Short mmCIF file of all heavy atoms in Angstrom, two decimals:
data_model
loop_
_atom_site.label_atom_id
_atom_site.label_comp_id
_atom_site.label_asym_id
_atom_site.label_seq_id
_atom_site.Cartn_x
_atom_site.Cartn_y
_atom_site.Cartn_z
N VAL A 229 -12.22 0.42 -3.96
CA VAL A 229 -12.10 -0.05 -2.59
C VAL A 229 -10.70 -0.61 -2.39
O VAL A 229 -10.05 -1.05 -3.34
CB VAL A 229 -13.18 -1.10 -2.26
CG1 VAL A 229 -12.89 -2.41 -2.96
CG2 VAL A 229 -13.32 -1.30 -0.76
N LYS A 230 -10.24 -0.59 -1.14
CA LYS A 230 -8.89 -1.02 -0.82
C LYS A 230 -8.68 -2.47 -1.22
O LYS A 230 -9.60 -3.29 -1.13
CB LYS A 230 -8.61 -0.85 0.67
CG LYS A 230 -9.10 0.46 1.25
CD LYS A 230 -8.62 0.64 2.67
CE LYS A 230 -7.20 1.17 2.72
NZ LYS A 230 -6.80 1.55 4.10
N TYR A 231 -7.46 -2.79 -1.65
CA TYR A 231 -7.14 -4.17 -2.00
C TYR A 231 -7.48 -5.13 -0.87
O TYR A 231 -7.90 -6.27 -1.11
CB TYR A 231 -5.66 -4.30 -2.37
CG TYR A 231 -5.31 -3.64 -3.68
CD1 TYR A 231 -5.08 -2.28 -3.75
CD2 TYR A 231 -5.19 -4.39 -4.84
CE1 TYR A 231 -4.76 -1.68 -4.94
CE2 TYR A 231 -4.87 -3.79 -6.04
CZ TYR A 231 -4.65 -2.44 -6.08
OH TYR A 231 -4.33 -1.84 -7.27
N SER A 232 -7.39 -4.65 0.37
CA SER A 232 -7.57 -5.48 1.55
C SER A 232 -9.02 -5.92 1.69
O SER A 232 -9.41 -6.49 2.72
CB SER A 232 -7.13 -4.73 2.80
OG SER A 232 -7.69 -5.31 3.97
N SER A 233 -9.84 -5.65 0.68
CA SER A 233 -11.21 -6.15 0.67
C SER A 233 -11.64 -6.70 -0.68
O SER A 233 -12.80 -7.12 -0.81
CB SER A 233 -12.18 -5.06 1.13
OG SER A 233 -12.20 -4.96 2.54
N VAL A 234 -10.75 -6.72 -1.68
CA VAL A 234 -11.14 -7.25 -3.00
C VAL A 234 -11.70 -8.66 -2.86
O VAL A 234 -12.81 -8.95 -3.33
CB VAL A 234 -9.95 -7.21 -3.97
CG1 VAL A 234 -10.41 -7.60 -5.36
CG2 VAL A 234 -9.36 -5.84 -4.02
N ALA A 235 -10.94 -9.54 -2.21
CA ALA A 235 -11.37 -10.92 -2.02
C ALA A 235 -12.78 -10.99 -1.45
O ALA A 235 -13.54 -11.90 -1.78
CB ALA A 235 -10.39 -11.65 -1.11
N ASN A 236 -13.15 -10.03 -0.60
CA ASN A 236 -14.52 -9.96 -0.12
C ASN A 236 -15.49 -9.74 -1.27
O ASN A 236 -16.33 -10.59 -1.57
CB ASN A 236 -14.65 -8.85 0.93
CG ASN A 236 -14.18 -9.29 2.29
OD1 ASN A 236 -13.01 -9.10 2.64
ND2 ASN A 236 -15.08 -9.87 3.07
N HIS A 237 -15.36 -8.58 -1.94
CA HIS A 237 -16.34 -8.18 -2.95
C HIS A 237 -16.63 -9.30 -3.93
O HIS A 237 -17.80 -9.59 -4.22
CB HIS A 237 -15.85 -6.94 -3.69
CG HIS A 237 -16.01 -5.67 -2.92
ND1 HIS A 237 -15.32 -5.40 -1.76
CD2 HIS A 237 -16.79 -4.58 -3.15
CE1 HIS A 237 -15.66 -4.21 -1.31
NE2 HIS A 237 -16.55 -3.69 -2.14
N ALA A 238 -15.58 -9.96 -4.43
CA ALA A 238 -15.76 -11.06 -5.36
C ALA A 238 -16.79 -12.05 -4.84
O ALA A 238 -17.86 -12.24 -5.43
CB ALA A 238 -14.42 -11.75 -5.61
N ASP A 239 -16.51 -12.65 -3.68
CA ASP A 239 -17.49 -13.56 -3.09
C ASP A 239 -18.81 -12.84 -2.85
O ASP A 239 -19.88 -13.35 -3.21
CB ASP A 239 -16.95 -14.17 -1.80
CG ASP A 239 -16.07 -15.38 -2.05
OD1 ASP A 239 -16.42 -16.19 -2.94
OD2 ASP A 239 -15.04 -15.53 -1.36
N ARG A 240 -18.74 -11.62 -2.31
CA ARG A 240 -19.97 -10.87 -2.05
C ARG A 240 -20.73 -10.59 -3.33
O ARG A 240 -21.97 -10.49 -3.30
CB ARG A 240 -19.65 -9.56 -1.32
CG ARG A 240 -20.90 -8.77 -0.95
CD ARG A 240 -20.61 -7.71 0.09
NE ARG A 240 -19.75 -6.65 -0.42
CZ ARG A 240 -19.31 -5.63 0.30
NH1 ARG A 240 -19.65 -5.53 1.58
NH2 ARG A 240 -18.54 -4.71 -0.25
N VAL A 241 -20.04 -10.48 -4.46
CA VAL A 241 -20.75 -10.22 -5.70
C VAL A 241 -21.09 -11.55 -6.36
O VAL A 241 -22.04 -11.65 -7.14
CB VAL A 241 -19.95 -9.31 -6.65
CG1 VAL A 241 -18.85 -10.08 -7.35
CG2 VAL A 241 -20.88 -8.66 -7.66
N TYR A 242 -20.33 -12.60 -6.01
CA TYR A 242 -20.49 -13.87 -6.72
C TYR A 242 -21.91 -14.40 -6.58
O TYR A 242 -22.57 -14.71 -7.58
CB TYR A 242 -19.49 -14.91 -6.21
CG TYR A 242 -19.25 -16.00 -7.22
CD1 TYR A 242 -18.29 -15.85 -8.21
CD2 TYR A 242 -20.01 -17.16 -7.22
CE1 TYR A 242 -18.07 -16.83 -9.15
CE2 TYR A 242 -19.80 -18.15 -8.16
CZ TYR A 242 -18.83 -17.97 -9.12
OH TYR A 242 -18.60 -18.95 -10.07
N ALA A 243 -22.40 -14.50 -5.34
CA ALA A 243 -23.78 -14.92 -5.13
C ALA A 243 -24.74 -14.04 -5.91
O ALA A 243 -25.70 -14.54 -6.52
CB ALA A 243 -24.11 -14.89 -3.64
N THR A 244 -24.49 -12.73 -5.93
CA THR A 244 -25.36 -11.81 -6.66
C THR A 244 -25.51 -12.24 -8.11
O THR A 244 -26.60 -12.09 -8.69
CB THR A 244 -24.81 -10.39 -6.58
OG1 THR A 244 -24.76 -9.98 -5.20
CG2 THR A 244 -25.70 -9.42 -7.34
N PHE A 245 -24.46 -12.80 -8.71
CA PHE A 245 -24.60 -13.37 -10.03
C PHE A 245 -25.14 -14.80 -9.96
O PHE A 245 -26.03 -15.16 -10.73
CB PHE A 245 -23.26 -13.34 -10.76
CG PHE A 245 -23.25 -14.10 -12.05
CD1 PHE A 245 -24.18 -13.84 -13.03
CD2 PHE A 245 -22.29 -15.08 -12.28
CE1 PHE A 245 -24.17 -14.54 -14.22
CE2 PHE A 245 -22.28 -15.78 -13.47
CZ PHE A 245 -23.22 -15.51 -14.44
N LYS A 246 -24.62 -15.60 -9.03
CA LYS A 246 -25.02 -17.00 -8.94
C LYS A 246 -26.51 -17.13 -8.68
O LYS A 246 -27.22 -17.86 -9.38
CB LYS A 246 -24.22 -17.71 -7.85
CG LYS A 246 -24.66 -19.14 -7.60
CD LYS A 246 -23.98 -19.72 -6.37
CE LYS A 246 -24.84 -19.56 -5.13
NZ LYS A 246 -24.57 -20.62 -4.12
N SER A 247 -27.01 -16.42 -7.66
CA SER A 247 -28.44 -16.44 -7.38
C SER A 247 -29.26 -15.85 -8.51
O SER A 247 -30.47 -16.09 -8.58
CB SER A 247 -28.73 -15.70 -6.08
OG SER A 247 -30.10 -15.36 -5.98
N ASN A 248 -28.64 -15.08 -9.40
CA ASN A 248 -29.35 -14.58 -10.57
C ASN A 248 -29.37 -15.58 -11.71
O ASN A 248 -30.15 -15.41 -12.65
CB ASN A 248 -28.74 -13.25 -11.03
CG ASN A 248 -29.23 -12.07 -10.21
OD1 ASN A 248 -29.67 -12.23 -9.08
ND2 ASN A 248 -29.14 -10.88 -10.79
N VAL A 249 -28.52 -16.61 -11.66
CA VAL A 249 -28.59 -17.69 -12.64
C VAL A 249 -29.93 -18.41 -12.54
O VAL A 249 -30.44 -18.93 -13.53
CB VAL A 249 -27.40 -18.66 -12.45
CG1 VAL A 249 -27.52 -19.86 -13.37
CG2 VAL A 249 -26.08 -17.93 -12.68
N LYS A 250 -30.52 -18.42 -11.34
CA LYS A 250 -31.85 -18.97 -11.17
C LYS A 250 -32.85 -18.17 -12.00
O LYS A 250 -32.81 -16.94 -12.02
CB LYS A 250 -32.25 -18.95 -9.70
CG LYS A 250 -31.10 -19.28 -8.76
CD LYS A 250 -31.57 -19.45 -7.33
CE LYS A 250 -32.33 -20.74 -7.14
NZ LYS A 250 -32.72 -20.95 -5.72
N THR A 251 -33.74 -18.88 -12.70
CA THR A 251 -34.68 -18.23 -13.60
C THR A 251 -35.61 -17.30 -12.85
O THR A 251 -35.72 -17.35 -11.62
CB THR A 251 -35.49 -19.28 -14.36
OG1 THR A 251 -36.35 -19.98 -13.45
CG2 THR A 251 -34.57 -20.28 -15.04
N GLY A 252 -36.30 -16.44 -13.60
CA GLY A 252 -37.16 -15.43 -13.02
C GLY A 252 -36.45 -14.19 -12.52
O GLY A 252 -37.11 -13.21 -12.19
N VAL A 253 -35.12 -14.22 -12.46
CA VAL A 253 -34.32 -13.09 -12.01
C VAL A 253 -33.34 -12.73 -13.12
O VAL A 253 -32.83 -13.61 -13.81
CB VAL A 253 -33.57 -13.43 -10.70
CG1 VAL A 253 -32.72 -12.26 -10.25
CG2 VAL A 253 -34.56 -13.82 -9.61
N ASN A 254 -33.10 -11.43 -13.30
CA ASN A 254 -32.23 -10.94 -14.35
C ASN A 254 -30.77 -11.15 -13.99
O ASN A 254 -30.35 -10.87 -12.86
CB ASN A 254 -32.52 -9.47 -14.64
CG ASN A 254 -32.48 -8.60 -13.39
OD1 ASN A 254 -32.18 -9.08 -12.30
ND2 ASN A 254 -32.81 -7.33 -13.55
N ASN A 255 -29.99 -11.65 -14.95
CA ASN A 255 -28.56 -11.84 -14.79
C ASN A 255 -27.76 -10.78 -15.54
O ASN A 255 -26.57 -10.96 -15.80
CB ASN A 255 -28.15 -13.24 -15.25
CG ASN A 255 -28.44 -13.49 -16.72
OD1 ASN A 255 -28.90 -12.61 -17.45
ND2 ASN A 255 -28.18 -14.72 -17.17
#
């Protein structure tokens, strides 16, 4: 994806990992 959206994906992916830190969900 274009550099002009990298900063997006990081945050957009961050929750995907952060919310997976909660138990019952795979990290």
Side-chain angles (χ1 to χ4, degrees):
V229 72
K230 316 188 82 171
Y231 290 81
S232 161
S233 279
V234 187
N236 279 92
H237 282 66
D239 276 320
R240 183 163 67 183
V241 77
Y242 202 87
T244 299
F245 171 54
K246 174 189 95 153
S247 162
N248 279 23
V249 175
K250 322 188 73 176
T251 67
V253 179
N254 52 4
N255 61 4

